[PDB]
Design a protein around this ligand. Structure first.
Ligand SMILES: O=C([O-])C(=O)[O-]
Ligand code: NI
Length: 494
């Protein structure tokens, strides 16, 4: 049995470089080792962390940030303004190829005015900046002469976070020990292990045979825990959605009428009702848990007749087999799903069924996450979503310059290029006035409807399943893959 002083938590995704500069919002380990200037509480409220306070100028261009003087890095060295300037400059240096480059490109200058005071000046307003500064700070004294891209640091990280790095068995687990000088509070469980388990049926089994203490578990597997008193189940809300990603390079899917038709073809109400057992709600756009949600937008209602009318209009005709065809080619394409994710496999199956009903042929291809290039398939059962500022999973996902065929750190895997979307997100992220921001996000949402990059399917709840001995777990609004479910792990204990 797992000792009382050890926490073992399963997490779906890992990261090859435990370094805030390469955060892709998929891991649970950078936030153990590192901490940022700001943080969020159970209500997703912005709170001071490494920074004690801050003032922003009326024009939104200047940030005066005041730091704690009582923080140590894991190696004993004090945390100073030196680190903060090194870090922010590090994220916006193009030679570092940072995954969060777009969160810091707008910084013009970082001035250290006293050892606990930095003055950050921006080219244009970027209200998302304080959310952005929740990213971990890096240690200047260890990395200032390093190649941030390849440094051995990335596999031996030193941070200011609640947990010190111990060892790493690649592909299997990372092991940590409590930071006994953690400025924020005392870490309760001295030993913590994050186990890499990307298939929930395997996670489920390891809960049952006592190999792990906690995991997020797909709704399809919850039945074997609902009547087991040895476990609790915490339902967590999230901003995470699932969708069909259209690859716009595909000869059929590039066509606006075809993409609209495929949207009209899917009975989303039936999916959420039946597959997801109301651990989900129907999705239509990517900001429906945001303040940025326009709440009055157009949608593609389930309408098979309209789908067919659209495909006729696009020049297709049902052949003798009942399949839409144009110029000797039937309208067909592949739908790819992560085979280790039962929800996505089920969804790819349902889409294939829905399309078949209107004479669209498709092939489901299920392969393990990480084993194929998601930007090189006709379509992909994709997911994104962040409870933080609406910029964070929209700019890298939809904007043209973030097309991943051009931008190694872009998340626009479908190669989507829309002028109204580009303009809307750019204005939205660089305007200070909240009401103005909402206006631009409405333009963005409306533009997405007119030129849909996806079929949006559903927003997910997550089920945190945990050994009943576990105390201290707090919920909050999770992100994509349920990331964030370990946000207060330093308060957890047995
Ligand atoms: O992050 C993604 O690409 C996903 O999970 O679909
Ligand atoms: Ni993902």
């Amino acid at each position: 049995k797992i000792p009382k002083d050890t926490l073992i938590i399963a997490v779906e995704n890992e990261i090859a470089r435990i370094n805030p500069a390469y955060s892709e919002d998929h891991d649970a380990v950078i936030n153990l080792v590192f901490s940022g200037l700001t943080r969020f509480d159970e209500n997703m409220s912005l709170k001071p962390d490494l920074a004690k306070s801050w003032d922003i100028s009326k024009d939104g261009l200047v940030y005066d940030i005041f730091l704690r003087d009582d923080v140590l890095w894991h190696d004993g060295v004090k945390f100073s303004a030196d680190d903060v300037k090194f870090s922010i400059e590090a994220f916006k240096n193009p030679k570092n190829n940072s995954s969060i480059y777009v969160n810091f490109e707008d910084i013009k200058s970082v001035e250290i005015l006293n050892p606990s005071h930095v003055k950050i000046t921006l080219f244009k307003p970027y209200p998302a900046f304080l959310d952005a500064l929740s990213i971990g700070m890096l240690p200047k004294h260890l990395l200032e002469n390093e190649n941030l891209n390849t440094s051995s640091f990335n596999q031996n990280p030193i941070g200011t976070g609640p947990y010190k790095f111990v060892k790493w068995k690649k592909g299997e687990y990372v092991e940590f020990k409590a930071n006994e000088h953690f400025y924020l509070d005392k870490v309760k469980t001295p030993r913590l292990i994050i186990k890499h388990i990307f298939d929930p049926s395997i996670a489920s089994a390891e809960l049952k045979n006592g190999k792990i203490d906690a995991a997020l578990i797909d709704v399809s597997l919850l039945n074997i825990f609902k009547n087991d008193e040895n476990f609790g189940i915490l339902r967590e809300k999230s901003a995470d959605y699932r969708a069909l990603m259209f690859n716009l390079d595909n000869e059929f899917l590039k066509d606006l009428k075809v993409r609209q038709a495929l949207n009209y073809a899917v009975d989303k109400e039936s999916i959420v009702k039946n597959l997801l057992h109301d651990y989900a709600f129907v999705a239509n756009h990517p900001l429906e848990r945001s303040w940025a949600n326009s709440k009055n937008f157009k949608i593609y209602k389930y309408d098979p007749k309209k789908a067919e009318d659209l495909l006729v209009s696009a020049g297709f005709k049902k052949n003798k087999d009942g399949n839409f065809e144009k110029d000797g080619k039937i309208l067909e394409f592949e739908i790819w799903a992560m085979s280790n994710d039962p929800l996505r496999v089920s969804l790819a199956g349902i889409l294939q069924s829905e399309f078949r009903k209107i004479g669209v042929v498709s092939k489901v291809v299920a392969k393990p996450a990480g084993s194929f290039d998601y930007s090189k398939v006709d379509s992909f059962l994709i997911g994104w979503g962040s409870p933080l500022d609406p910029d964070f999973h929209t700019f890298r996902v939809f904007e043209s310059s973030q097309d991943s065929a051009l931008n190694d750190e872009g998340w626009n895997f479908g190669h989507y290029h829309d002028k109204k979307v580009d303009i809307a997100l750019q204005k939205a992220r660089n305007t200070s006035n909240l009401e103005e921001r909402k206006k631009y996000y409405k333009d963005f949402i409306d533009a997405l409807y007119e030129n849909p990059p996806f079929i949006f399917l559903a927003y997910l709840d997550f089920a945190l399943v945990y050994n009943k001995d576990l105390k201290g777990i707090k919920t909050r609004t999770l992100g994509h893959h349920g990331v964030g479910f370990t946000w207060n792990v330093y308060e957890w204990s047995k």
